[PDB]
Design a protein around this motif. Structure first.
Motif, PDB file in Angstrom:
ATOM      1  N   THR B  19      33.506  36.129  59.831  1.00 21.59           N
ATOM      2  CA  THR B  19      32.487  35.129  60.150  1.00 21.59           C
ATOM      3  C   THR B  19      32.562  34.808  61.623  1.00 21.59           C
ATOM      4  OG1 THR B  19      31.519  33.006  59.549  1.00 21.59           O
ATOM      5  CG2 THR B  19      33.956  33.148  59.705  1.00 21.59           C
ATOM      6  N   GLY B 182      21.500  36.619  55.834  1.00 26.76           N
ATOM      7  CA  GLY B 182      22.313  35.469  55.511  1.00 26.76           C
ATOM      8  C   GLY B 182      22.264  35.140  54.038  1.00 26.76           C
ATOM      9  N   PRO B 185      25.914  31.723  54.071  1.00 20.88           N
ATOM     10  CA  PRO B 185      26.561  31.045  55.209  1.00 20.88           C
ATOM     11  C   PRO B 185      26.021  29.663  55.590  1.00 20.88           C
ATOM     12  CG  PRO B 185      24.932  32.462  56.085  1.00 20.88           C
ATOM     13  CD  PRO B 185      24.903  32.675  54.551  1.00 20.88           C
ATOM     14  N   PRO B 200      30.375  37.089  54.661  1.00 20.18           N
ATOM     15  CA  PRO B 200      30.609  36.499  55.984  1.00 20.18           C
ATOM     16  C   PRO B 200      29.657  37.081  57.037  1.00 20.18           C
ATOM     17  CG  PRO B 200      32.692  36.912  54.900  1.00 20.18           C
ATOM     18  CD  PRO B 200      31.625  37.508  53.999  1.00 20.18           C
ATOM     19  N   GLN B 201      29.174  36.225  57.926  1.00 20.80           N
ATOM     20  CA  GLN B 201      27.945  36.517  58.643  1.00 20.80           C
ATOM     21  C   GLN B 201      28.077  37.545  59.780  1.00 20.80           C
ATOM     22  OE1 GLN B 201      25.009  36.147  57.702  1.00 20.80           O
ATOM     23  NE2 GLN B 201      23.752  34.781  58.980  1.00 20.80           N
ATOM     24  N   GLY B 224      24.718  29.395  59.237  1.00 13.71           N
ATOM     25  CA  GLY B 224      26.115  29.315  59.624  1.00 13.71           C
ATOM     26  C   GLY B 224      26.366  29.147  61.107  1.00 13.71           C
TER      27      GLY B 224
END
Ligand SMILES: NC(=O)c1ccc[n+]([C@@H]2O[C@H](COP(=O)([O-])OP(=O)(O)OC[C@H]3O[C@@H](n4cnc5c(N)ncnc54)[C@H](O)[C@@H]3O)[C@@H](O)[C@H]2O)c1
Ligand SMILES: NC(=O)c1ccc[n+]([C@@H]2O[C@H](COP(=O)([O-])OP(=O)(O)OC[C@H]3O[C@@H](n4cnc5c(N)ncnc54)[C@H](O)[C@@H]3O)[C@@H](O)[C@H]2O)c1
Ligand SMILES: NC(=O)c1ccc[n+]([C@@H]2O[C@H](COP(=O)([O-])OP(=O)(O)OC[C@H]3O[C@@H](n4cnc5c(N)ncnc54)[C@H](O)[C@@H]3O)[C@@H](O)[C@H]2O)c1
Ligand SMILES: NC(=O)c1ccc[n+]([C@@H]2O[C@H](COP(=O)([O-])OP(=O)(O)OC[C@H]3O[C@@H](n4cnc5c(N)ncnc54)[C@H](O)[C@@H]3O)[C@@H](O)[C@H]2O)c1
Ligand SMILES: O=c1[nH]c(=O)c2[nH+]cn([C@@H]3O[C@H](COP(=O)(O)O)[C@@H](O)[C@H]3O)c2[nH]1
Ligand SMILES: O=c1[nH]c(=O)c2[nH+]cn([C@@H]3O[C@H](COP(=O)(O)O)[C@@H](O)[C@H]3O)c2[nH]1
Ligand SMILES: O=c1[nH]c(=O)c2[nH+]cn([C@@H]3O[C@H](COP(=O)(O)O)[C@@H](O)[C@H]3O)c2[nH]1
Ligand SMILES: O=c1[nH]c(=O)c2[nH+]cn([C@@H]3O[C@H](COP(=O)(O)O)[C@@H](O)[C@H]3O)c2[nH]1
Lengths: 333, 333, 333, 333
Positions: B19, B182, B185, B200-201, B224
């Motif tokens: 991330t 996405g 997130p 996770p982005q 996120g």
């Protein structure tokens, strides 16, 4: 050259253990929407549930009221064994008389446990759960085998708990109709602190499934499920059902009364190895938020599972068991 | 020998997902100072923005006031779809009448979404955003393809959201003019807890870009982003623009009124899957600090981006997309 | 097969960056006790310090009082550049008139910075520090080269800051007499949040040293040192001196007055990129505990360093630079 | 290509160090129940304990009362050396006169330490512990060798502390009858912060055991044990006994009086390198919860150990030393 974590034995640290919070399910191609997903799944070789959820065999989770509500919701309860044999057998009868609902009941190991088991079978129980902290102990494998040879085509026999491939394989060989996984993960469990023993639950499920799936034996994921998302993760790791303690302990149907504190409501929840339940305890006594009716809690949990099934393109639990994970870092929480 | 994390399938845990907080941009040789950096970037195949920022299609983030302010700041707003078709189309007209500003609008999937889309196109919208939690569902790919074949050279069609290379590739094949990334997130997202699903982005962007970049299709990083530094990270991972919810929800131009608490000011911010917005919700209702005028927030965000461009020696966003990361440990936070 | 963290480029995530908290020094065979260790080390090619510590060029850390105290303690101060040229040059003279003590002074880049540098050289400064956030910018490399060719055998020229091997190599080629390392790590630094840019400091030192050591150029570790143990870690990673901001900001000799709060004492400490010091700031304004006389703080820091030297069997800093690390896990904190 | 964590030397970061919280013991096949486990283990080559626990040589942990109680509980105390020689020797006599109980006593290095050692031997001590922060210092190896050659078949000589294979090997060569492991892990230890030196304790034990086990020399795990589960982990990593400070400091038998605060009781606990015990201190002064009688604390600790032995199928400590670990992630805590 040494092993990077110490010593010269590469098998001393045998595995890297993942828990639920270590992974997420990857979305995949999908023609499934949450509404059309089928959540049915095998509890045991012979028993299929509409909803792949079982309530824990704990005296703050499952007595007859919880067992009836669980069965009506499409799952099942396992009646706890911290009560006299006559009373536990009585509660089996109470459940069976409520419309031929499915029910299970826990037994331990030894002569008294045997008498208890025979009474439960006579009361019409569907599933006996040999209910221990360590099913890889020879005494537990013997109990599972003895029950299966004696009452095995009248009743299903579940063995647990295990945390490794070898322990799962041993229960398969002893004739278990399902294998229950979880050593260390329970919310009220202190085994990891007291004994220093445990296995993170995603890895434990992956390993048990590697023994059980080729043998056609369903795996019950037991302990550490905190959120509906964890149920989807347990089933994707290859479990066929999940057993829930803390997520169900706060419900109206759980034994125990409402505790009012600061305008908030709680219910008592305690390990079956806690001092109060039983000495070197391996469980704690605590409380959980009051959650209201069981039926509504199960609707929320199944709703999360159905969402996961839509995201992963899984029309059935059998397809969800083929989904993939991405591992996340600490930053991911 | 087993996979070290369990089982015998090395693809079961398919990836290690990073991330934003897992990485930093490495400084590099530079003849760029923040003042000379060029922040322009493609929103879609046909549309370039001066500032590579888009406001989220949320009823606590983007109605006509936010869309006008975003376009004037050099970015764009996507009007949310939690309001009648006539009203959403009206807000498109309000934006277009404010000096031929760019504007987008969200639509869902199905017959009602189709009527909504046609009205938006008639009102002069520049970008239709097919706005879903899971664009790898066949129904979403069909909606994107149907819109592109019907109104595709009058309007740009964005599809989302995706979190994998295969999902991005599917949207490319369906004819998307941009792919929005996405799943999991968002700050107000509870998909990871409820369904146990997400990616996770940074890894999600890296994977989507691996499908989209060779096809000449821009990637929008959505969800996120908590800090201006995250925008630089998203673009360096290969995104061409970033979509912002929480960073813009506190602004004067965001819908909703000022909440005064303890001498501090807040604004309501809620997921579009929250109970209030809509049941098993996958978003929460909350609040964010009041941030003042949008124009000043965007100046701070673009200032951070320009700093990153100077540190990485990137005169343009296209060069920033070639920057490198260093991974950091938990101790790094 | 993709890179496990995403995409198909194995160099996109170029490194795994360790910070001070990620490592410990391994004890080794020793005939050194803390009392017999020699803490002297090169600040630059030509200048050796008795104590390998330098105070930061910050307006809440080093003016003439701090510079005098640092030099008397066996280290050195770098006078900050947030004041008129005449005043900074005056403070250089104040230090030199206090017994021919060593002193450095910071300059920026450009025409005004040049005038400032020439005045500092005329006032008798020993070390010019080209003092920037990003020395891999071509303008900074040019300033370092221009100063070294013009005043280079009358004065030592330090360049910084860098966070990579390539940036360190560029400063070496430009003729730096030392290379200062640290992009992102300062306690009052918000570069990692605002720009998303940085490099964890142990890895940054290891990389800069890989360029600088073969060229005979000393590395100054600048930023993120929170404890005396961190100084030993920085020097073991190959730095020859450490620059300290927060560890010295609380001292009597630091600029600024005592702040009494709740019977506790504090002093103001702020980044030189903070709003108050200077807009998109990359530093914050804060406070640190009052620490008393500088002399006693330096005694505690050198005492920790001497302990590390005894544990690692290092009689000199040159041998400490050969010590080894063990990496620790998050559980290790 | 560089080492991924920096520089070109793959041995600079030599190891990945695991601590107790990084691992769990894996359950295994078992015919052991906690009641039948045998907890006896070698303290030294010649001395076997019934319970594999030793109390720390600290002036807030072990004087004669603690030593008597530890020996009666089946373990042993090591009398601290922060008191005159005559008094320490007197306390040895007090223990020996309480029924020929085992007892140890700490000595340092040098002439005064030698006089102290000779008096302790004359008073009938069973075990001399050369008690230092860094046994890989040549002076400590010399003290161990000198004691063993002089009084070596009248008394057992323990050397410590070490954190590496090479240091353990050096103590073996010097003739140590046991090797004590722990640099950095103590609860009241600030060596990791002050000097930046240490080794996570599971890896330190694994490495020391790799030198000591082939030489038939027992390893004492010293420091960082917070829970009974940690004792099982230390012994499984290959230690033969564990030394406890904080876990025993709260007991009635520990020196110091009861501190009543807020209706809660505490006892003082401090490092032997703290200011109060002794300057650059490497220990702190603190307090721990009052725990009641030692006998009951030891029963709880041995109960946890016995549980671990049952889970791992270990009838003896020698078999527990062959158990395996699973590594856990941060999410695992
Ligand atoms: N977790 C979430 O629910 C989530 C995530 C991102 C954005 N949002 C926002 O919430 C609003 C509603 O979005 P939505 O997608 O829930 O709307 P929706 O109910 O209109 O669904 C639209 C289409 O998305 C697909 N879809 C959505 N969730 C799915 C799942 N779990 N499994 C399979 N297919 C699925 C289906 O094809 C569905 O027909 C939008 O404004 C969106 O931006 C919600
Ligand atoms: N993040 C920060 O801004 C930062 C970091 C470290 C130190 N400082 C301190 O703040 C003060 C000001 O330093 P400064 O470097 O901001 O001063 P500055 O504005 O005087 O810049 C000096 C030179 O550094 C280079 N530079 C700085 N930031 C850059 C970027 N983002 N991209 C490309 N080139 C860049 C440029 O060549 C510029 O001409 C100094 O005292 C310094 O020690 C600031
Ligand atoms: N960090 C610590 O200081 C530390 C660590 C563990 C235990 N202790 C406890 O504190 C007390 C004092 O122990 P001590 O070893 O500080 O006593 P000490 O001052 O008596 O030193 C004894 C010998 O240990 C060696 N030594 C100790 N620290 C060293 C270093 N940093 N570098 C090189 N050699 C070193 C030297 O050879 C010294 O002669 C003891 O009771 C001990 O159990 C302290
Ligand atoms: N940590 C725990 O104690 C733990 C863990 C999981 C569940 N529980 C719950 O607590 C209740 C009691 O379970 P129990 O297994 O402690 O009951 P128990 O005392 O009835 O033991 C049953 C059998 O399990 C085996 N066993 C249990 N712990 C062992 C160990 N440490 N080593 C070797 N063998 C062991 C033994 O063969 C024993 O005969 C049950 O309801 C169970 O669901 C306890
Ligand atoms: O280590 C344990 N000590 C105990 O005292 C205890 N009591 C129950 N259990 C187990 O925990 C499961 C419930 O876990 P959750 O609350 O996380 O759902 C249950 O289903 C059991 O497997 C225990 N485990
Ligand atoms: O899981 C979700 N449940 C929701 O209810 C929800 N509402 C919005 N979104 C998405 O979140 C993005 C905004 O994210 P940030 O606040 O982090 O900018 C948005 O741009 C959307 O992509 C949701 N995601
Ligand atoms: O990113 C930054 N923004 C700022 O405003 C700033 N001011 C100082 N510095 C740098 O920080 C160092 C001091 O760091 P410590 O307080 O951790 O010792 C100093 O020595 C500088 O290298 C800054 N870095
Ligand atoms: O770094 C240290 N500084 C000190 O001042 C100190 N005093 C004791 N010890 C060591 O710590 C052990 C006790 O550790 P626990 O409290 O974790 O059991 C003890 O058994 C010793 O090994 C020290 N270590």
């Amino acid at each position: 050259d040494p092993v990077p974590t110490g010593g010269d034995d590469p098998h001393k640290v045998a595995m890297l253990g993942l828990t639920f919070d270590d992974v997420l399910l990857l979305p995949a191609a999908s023609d499934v929407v949450p509404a059309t997903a089928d959540t049915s799944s095998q509890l045991t070789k012979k028993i299929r549930l509409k909803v792949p959820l079982v309530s824990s065999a704990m005296d703050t989770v499952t007595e007859s009221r919880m067992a009836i509500a669980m069965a009506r919701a499409g799952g099942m309860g396992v009646l706890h064994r911290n009560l006299p044999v006559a009373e536990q057998a009585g509660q089996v009868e109470m459940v069976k008389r409520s419309g031929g609902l499915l029910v299970g009941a826990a037994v331990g190991v030894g002569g008294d446990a045997w008498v208890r088991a025979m009474m439960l079978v006579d009361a019409g129980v569907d599933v006996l759960v040999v209910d221990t902290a360590h099913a890889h102990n020879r005494l537990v494998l013997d109990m599972v085998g003895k029950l299966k040879s004696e009452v095995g085509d009248r009743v299903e026999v579940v063995g647990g708990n295990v945390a490794t491939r070898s322990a799962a394989a041993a229960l398969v060989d002893a004739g278990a109709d399902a294998v229950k996984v979880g050593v260390g993960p329970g919310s009220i469990c202190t085994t990891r602190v007291v004994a220093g023993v445990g296995a993170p639950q995603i890895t434990a499920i992956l390993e048990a499934v590697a023994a059980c799936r080729p043998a056609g034996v369903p795996v019950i994921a037991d302990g550490g499920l905190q959120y509906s998302g964890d149920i989807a993760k347990a089933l994707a790791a290859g479990a066929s059902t999940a057993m829930l303690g803390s997520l169900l302990a706060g419900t109206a149907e759980a034994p125990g009364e409402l505790i009012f504190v600061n305008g908030k409501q709680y219910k008592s929840y305690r390990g079956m190895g806690s001092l109060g339940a039983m000495l070197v305890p391996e469980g704690i006594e605590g409380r959980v938020p009051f959650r209201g009716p069981l039926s509504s809690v199960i609707h929320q949990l199944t709703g999360g599972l159905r969402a996961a099934m839509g995201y992963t393109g899984s029309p059935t639990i059998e397809v969800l068991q083929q989904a993939q994970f991405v591992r996340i870092t600490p930053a991911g929480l």
